[PDB]
Amino acid sequence: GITGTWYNQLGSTFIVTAGADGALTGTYESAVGNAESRYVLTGRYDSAPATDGSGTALGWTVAWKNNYRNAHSATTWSGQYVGGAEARINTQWLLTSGTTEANAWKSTLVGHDTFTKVKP
Amino acid sequence: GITGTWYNQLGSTFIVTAGADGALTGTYESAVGNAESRYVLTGRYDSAPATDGSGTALGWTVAWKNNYRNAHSATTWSGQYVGGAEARINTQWLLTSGTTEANAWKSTLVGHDTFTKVKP
Amino acid sequence: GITGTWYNQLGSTFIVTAGADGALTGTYESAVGNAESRYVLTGRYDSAPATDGSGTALGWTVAWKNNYRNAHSATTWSGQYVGGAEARINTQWLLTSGTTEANAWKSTLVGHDTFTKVKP
Amino acid sequence: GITGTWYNQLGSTFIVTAGADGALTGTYESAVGNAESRYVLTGRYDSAPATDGSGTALGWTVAWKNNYRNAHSATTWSGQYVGGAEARINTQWLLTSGTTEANAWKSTLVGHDTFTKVKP
Numbered sequence A, B, C, D: 001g002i003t004g005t006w007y008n009q010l011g012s013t014f015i016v017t018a019g020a021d022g023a024l025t026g027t028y029e030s031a032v033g034n035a036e037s038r039y040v041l042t043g044r045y046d047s048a049p050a051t052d053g054s055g056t057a058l059g060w061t062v063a064w065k066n067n068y069r070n071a072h073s074a075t076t077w078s079g080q081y082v083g084g085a086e087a088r089i090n091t092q093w094l095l096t097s098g099t100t101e102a103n104a105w106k107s108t109l110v111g112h113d114t115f116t117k118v119k120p
């Protein structure tokens, strides 16, 4: 299942609990960027996925403020959990920084992260 | 200035509380506002934004399952709140559907929503 | 319909020709209108769109090198032309910069541009 | 290093010439290897990249019409070429379909493709 400790291809650590009500909660620790130690995450998942072989849709958000640092930014991951002997969560993400209006056209980075239960 | 009701460009509504802890919690629904159109949302925002004129970074997730309906998908919105008399939340979003691996390349839609406090 | 001079919401100027073969060719520049701000574009469009009221799919690329400046980056716009009283091109775009592998996670910006044949 | 035949992670074949003028020209075969599956591509690349370990920025478009078929859609790939013994083109893509205005919110898929010089 989704609940567990996951790592992406960059070595970031995603510690998540999937609640019976569809909630995702936990912490995220980035291996990259303006980031130190753990950040709160919250999100949602489909708690009754299709039974036709499809993955389980989910998403979560981290605002990159904690007691140590504040990057004035937030990332959302949108993806699906795919069961198997090598369980994986495949995502794409949007990282939006707070900007002035003049800089808003460059406010948002996009990428893709794949998570498994092992580090790189 | 984030707490309250916001409206997008297409007759959808959300309703959010921005907690002191950086949490976003509320509901996402239709203009119609019927039970079957309402879904839980959760996310995060920067509770200590820059004071240089920059927007406030935020994001949230809705999984498209409620007690009535299940689309087996989730949307994440990543964006920034821009304050004023003409307050706005400018977002980009990712909507991932659960798929089989053969169909994964087509799992994710992208788009953009702008929210205002004024019911349109 | 596609052939012409288009302007995005930020005042960039897109001078395009839609060839009978599906080709898009032209230049992309900034409002100030200097030679040093002007770059080659190439792309493709659906030369035989549906007849059911749908828009016409298209895309183009600008690499941000000209005889004066090189940003070691490229933008692609993907979207559709919507004909009628006031014709419009609605796009989303990806801007990739050359990075080292360690920085590749932050190589790509995403946004959305709308074009009309009038200035904003 | 860009000119040649490339293969993505899903069996498509990207046949490209990188011109001295920054042009990308070629064919994309969504298949192995029939005429009905071949489409024109055009795009642009940084013809004077850095030699500091950074990738070479680039992008291209396919409109999914040929003499046999027409999906009324176009993909743009935005990314970077990374040279060396294990050369890659790492991309993110946007696939826009022509839609009605009512369906425009769901016009654009996003994903990622990695291309190699050896068949996967």
Ligand SMILES: CNS(=O)(=O)c1cccc(-c2cc3c(=O)[nH]ccc3o2)c1
Pocket: A008, A010, A012, A029, A030, A031, A032, A033, A034, A035, A064, A071, A072, A073, A075, A093, A095, A097, A111, A113, C105, C106
């Ligand atoms: C906003 N400034 S920053 O330097 O770019 C920044 C700050 C904090 C964290 C991230 C970060 C981690 C992280 C990850 O693990 N996968 C994808 C995206 C990504 O972004 C990026």
Ligand SMILES: CNS(=O)(=O)c1cccc(-c2cc3c(=O)[nH]ccc3o2)c1
Pocket: B008, B012, B030, B036, B037, B064, B069, B071, B073, B075, B093, B095, B113
């Ligand atoms: C009444 N709910 S619904 O029709 O079943 C449904 C199902 C899946 C998705 C969306 C939906 C809305 C919505 C939006 O307002 N911005 C971005 C994405 C997005 O997706 C709505």
Ligand SMILES: CNS(=O)(=O)c1cccc(-c2cc3c(=O)[nH]ccc3o2)c1
Pocket: C008, C010, C012, C064, C071, C072, C073, C074, C075, C093, C095, C097, C111, C113
């Ligand atoms: C790293 N290259 S760059 O400095 O970011 C650069 C240089 C010149 C022009 C643009 C540019 C214009 C432009 C636009 O009109 N719509 C979307 C994206 C976009 O990018 C970007």
Ligand SMILES: CNS(=O)(=O)c1cccc(-c2cc3c(=O)[nH]ccc3o2)c1
Pocket: D008, D012, D030, D064, D071, D072, D073, D075, D093, D095, D097, D111, D113
């Ligand atoms: C709406 N058009 S379509 O039916 O979905 C269609 C038809 C033929 C080929 C593709 C296609 C291949 C392909 C690829 O290799 N990477 C990225 C996107 C992408 O799209 C898409």
